[PDB]
mmCIF file of C-alpha atoms in Angstrom:
data_model
loop_
_atom_site.group_PDB
_atom_site.id
_atom_site.type_symbol
_atom_site.label_atom_id
_atom_site.label_comp_id
_atom_site.label_asym_id
_atom_site.label_seq_id
_atom_site.Cartn_x
_atom_site.Cartn_y
_atom_site.Cartn_z
ATOM 1 C CA UNK A 1 10.436 -17.957 63.885
ATOM 2 C CA UNK A 2 12.083 -16.808 60.650
ATOM 3 C CA UNK A 3 12.331 -13.182 61.826
ATOM 4 C CA UNK A 4 13.873 -14.609 65.015
ATOM 5 C CA UNK A 5 16.456 -16.177 62.692
ATOM 6 C CA UNK A 6 16.901 -13.150 60.425
ATOM 7 C CA UNK A 7 17.839 -10.829 63.292
ATOM 8 C CA UNK A 8 20.695 -13.157 64.425
ATOM 9 C CA UNK A 9 21.689 -13.084 60.750
ATOM 10 C CA UNK A 10 22.224 -9.374 61.351
ATOM 11 C CA UNK A 11 24.022 -10.113 64.633
ATOM 12 C CA UNK A 12 27.100 -11.804 63.167
ATOM 13 C CA UNK A 13 28.755 -7.926 49.349
ATOM 14 C CA UNK A 14 26.745 -6.926 52.412
ATOM 15 C CA UNK A 15 23.058 -7.535 51.591
ATOM 16 C CA UNK A 16 24.049 -9.147 48.335
ATOM 17 C CA UNK A 17 25.699 -12.449 49.188
ATOM 18 C CA UNK A 18 24.608 -12.270 52.821
ATOM 19 C CA UNK A 19 21.048 -11.592 51.659
ATOM 20 C CA UNK A 20 21.098 -14.756 49.533
ATOM 21 C CA UNK A 21 21.712 -16.702 52.758
ATOM 22 C CA UNK A 22 18.320 -15.588 54.107
ATOM 23 C CA UNK A 23 16.443 -17.358 51.301
ATOM 24 C CA UNK A 24 17.532 -20.968 52.226
ATOM 25 C CA UNK A 25 15.814 -20.743 55.621
ATOM 26 C CA UNK A 26 12.364 -20.206 54.149
ATOM 27 C CA UNK A 27 13.188 -22.872 51.555
ATOM 28 C CA UNK A 28 14.239 -25.341 54.251
ATOM 29 C CA UNK A 29 10.851 -24.860 55.902
ATOM 30 C CA UNK A 30 9.032 -25.371 52.586
ATOM 31 C CA UNK A 31 10.805 -28.627 51.735
ATOM 32 C CA UNK A 32 9.847 -29.758 55.243
ATOM 33 C CA UNK A 33 6.185 -28.993 54.586
ATOM 34 C CA UNK A 34 5.890 -30.228 50.993
ATOM 35 C CA UNK A 35 7.734 -33.444 51.829
ATOM 36 C CA UNK A 36 5.270 -34.137 54.614
ATOM 37 C CA UNK A 37 2.126 -33.497 52.566
ATOM 38 C CA UNK A 38 3.494 -35.654 49.733
ATOM 39 C CA UNK A 39 3.864 -38.454 52.286
ATOM 40 C CA UNK A 40 0.275 -38.290 53.456
ATOM 41 C CA UNK A 41 -1.205 -38.399 49.946
ATOM 42 C CA UNK A 42 0.734 -41.170 48.155
ATOM 43 C CA UNK A 43 -0.210 -43.291 51.158
ATOM 44 C CA UNK A 44 -3.478 -42.566 53.040
ATOM 45 C CA UNK A 45 -5.789 -41.741 50.050
ATOM 46 C CA UNK A 46 -3.214 -43.166 47.614
ATOM 47 C CA UNK A 47 -3.013 -41.317 44.305
ATOM 48 C CA UNK A 48 -0.431 -43.711 42.907
#
């Protein structure tokens, strides 16, 4: 998944600024996951 994105990142300052573009992709996954889990706890076994 991510490796299958990081090799097209090679396909198209080198490994300094370009390397700091790799880190958003694993962040974008994480905000997808954490935002989902937060949904299914504040409702469905409501903490709040």
